[PDB]
Amino acid sequence: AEVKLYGFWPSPFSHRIIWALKLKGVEYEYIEEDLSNKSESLLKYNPVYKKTPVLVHGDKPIAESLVILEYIEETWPENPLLPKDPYERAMARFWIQYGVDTVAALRAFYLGSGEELEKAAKELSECLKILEEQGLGDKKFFGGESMNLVDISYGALGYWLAAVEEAKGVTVLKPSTLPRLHAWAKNLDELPVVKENIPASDKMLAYVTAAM
Template identity: 65%
Template sequence: MEELKLHGFWPSSYSSRVTWALKLKGVEYEYIEENLSNKSELLLKYNPVHKKIPVLVHGGKPIAESLVILEYIEETWPKNPLLPTHAYDRAIARFWIQYGAAKGPFFFSVFRSSGEEQEKAAKEVLAVLKVLEEQGLGDKKFFGGDTINLVDIAYGWLPHWFETIQEVIGIKLLESTTCPRLYAWVNNFKEVPVIKENLPDPEKLLAHIKNIREKLVAEKTD
């Protein structure tokens, strides 16, 4: 087997996506923790365009961007598939993955803003969550049906990272009263063994996100 390495960063949900996929596939790899304040020469070499994590290096060849990496993992290790068999179902899965990627800026906006701007962003985020619940998840336990697939993994930041963001900003959007089916999915997702065993420490993550929020607020007041 060719050497496989993952360059990541412990609080990053993008890194976790890749970790979950590799572990669900049963693929062995070496994890390399990056310091994003002092990026390694290897990271800059492997991802010279964006200079970001995660980067998966397979046989010396780097693949960057988490969603691209997930597709690469699915194609390279077809055992334990994470996309549906039927072409139409795969297309629908990819649609919802792209929907989440396109709506990501709304979630960041509610995190970095305050006052009326934050209230507006919060309404936009709630609208996105409701579309995701009603049109994407529906009555299924997971986006993948009875088991998780790449869509669940792509939205895997909601159950842990977004929960922590809500705590930091003091706004509750993804709740049992607002999005009951999506809220149930959150709890089901966190109980999947591979997910549960590969989440960052909640207290460390809370401190990390608080620190980011404080820096954003300071920048706006300078």
């Protein structure tokens, strides 16, 4: 208790938060929101955006996943999910901001069909190549030898992108073209903190298919 999380079951934005709380050992009450029938609590706690997720700590709300993650890191500092050095912290924030570009590429892919899909797939691959070569490099995690907030932010490139790829019949994140990023996503997907806190594959595929 004392910590509440208003979430949406299939959303990586919500999953990210769960992962961070679990890595911090913070107990939370999870509240599932029906996005088509938003609770009064949700509208009250996030009047600007009226979206999930929303973390409430001591009756005070924090909205926007990226902001919530930073708040969790600063509020429960043990087991740091950001490094100490300002330059390395800036590189973490830089690659989290590149997540904006990645989300856009993922969106185009998710929405494409025909020639559009082919183009989107290609642009997503190019987006991920930059992330792999210049962000991840030869490190096991974006955080080096353990996960940091960048790993959390990109974790959806495993289970979630995999479900979208199955839905579209097109794989973008594949070992032959992105061997380091594919290995990273597979290793993250096998970590208990991730594996225990994502939806079952069938449910995840069923959701993204329906949405399409």
